[PDB]
Design a protein around this ligand. Sequence first.
Ligand SMILES: CCCCCCCC/C=C\CCCCCCCC(=O)OC[C@H](O)CO
Ligand SMILES: [Hg+2]
Ligand SMILES: [Hg+2]
Length: 270
Amino acid sequence: MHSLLIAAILGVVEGLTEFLPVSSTGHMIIVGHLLGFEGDTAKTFEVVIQLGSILAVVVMFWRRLFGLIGIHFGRPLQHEGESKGRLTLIHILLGMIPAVVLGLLFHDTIKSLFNPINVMYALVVGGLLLIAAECLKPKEPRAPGLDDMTYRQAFMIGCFQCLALWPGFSRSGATISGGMLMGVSRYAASEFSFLLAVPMMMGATALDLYKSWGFLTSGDIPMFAVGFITAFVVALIAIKTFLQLIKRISFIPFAIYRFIVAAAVYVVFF
Ligand SMILES: CCCCCCCC/C=C\CCCCCCCC(=O)OC[C@H](O)CO
Ligand SMILES: [Hg+2]
Ligand SMILES: [Hg+2]
C-alpha cells in the first residue's frame, strides 16, 4: 500500500534528521516532493510524526525530564558533570524564552519563509554556523557535562534558537552551535538541545495541530500512526547513535552534508 509505505519512509526521514543538525524540514520537503506527498494534508502529517520523534527523547530522558518538573522516582538521578551543579527547570526556561517571544511576535512572517529557496539558504548558512562553532569553540569546555551548564549558557543557547525559526536552519544545529560557542561540550550541547526540544516541539505541534485540526479525518489515522511510531523507533536509534558518535566525531561532516542537501533542494525544486 502506497499510503503506508510513504508514511514509513517519511517516518524514517523524520526520525533520523529531527535531532541531527541536518534539518528535518529540509529533508522533508525533498522527499515529500519526490514521493508526491505535498498537500495541506502532508504538512499536517509531517507535524504529527514530529511528535513520534519527540516521544523518543521523552523515553530516552524519562527520569531527567521528570526530575526537572519536580518528580524524582525514588532513586538518585544520574550525575553528568564535573561540578556539584544540577541542570534545573530554570535552564530549560531560559533556553525557551527568546525563541518563544520571537516566534510569537513574528508568527505570520516566519510562516512566509517556508520557500525551498529559503530552506536552501538555511542549510548552507546553518552549515557555516556549525563550521564556525567548531572553529571558534574553546580548547577546554567550560561545561563538559550537562549538569555543568550555567544559566548564561542556557540563555545564550536560547537566543541561538531564534535562528531555528528560519525554515531549514535546524533547531538542533542552532542550539548545538550556540552551546559549543558558549563552552558547552558537543555531547552536553546535544543533550541540552534534545531536552529543550521537548517543551519547544510539543508546544509547536500542539499549536500546529490546533490551527490545522480541520484537515484530520478518520482515514488519516492509519497513515498518521504508521509514520508516528516509525519516527519514534528511528529517533530512538538516531539519538542513541548520535550521542555515541559525537563523542569521537566533530560536526564538520554534518556541515558538509548540509551543503549536499542544499544542492538537492536546488536540483529538485529549480
Ligand atoms: C534521511 C536522510 C539521510 C539522513 C542523513 C544523516 C546525516 C548524516 C550525514 C553526515 C554525518 C556523517 C557522520 C556519520 C558517519 C560516521 C560513520 C563512522 O563510521 O564514523 C565513526 C568514526 O570511525 C568514529 O570512530
Ligand atoms: Hg579554524
Ligand atoms: Hg534570540
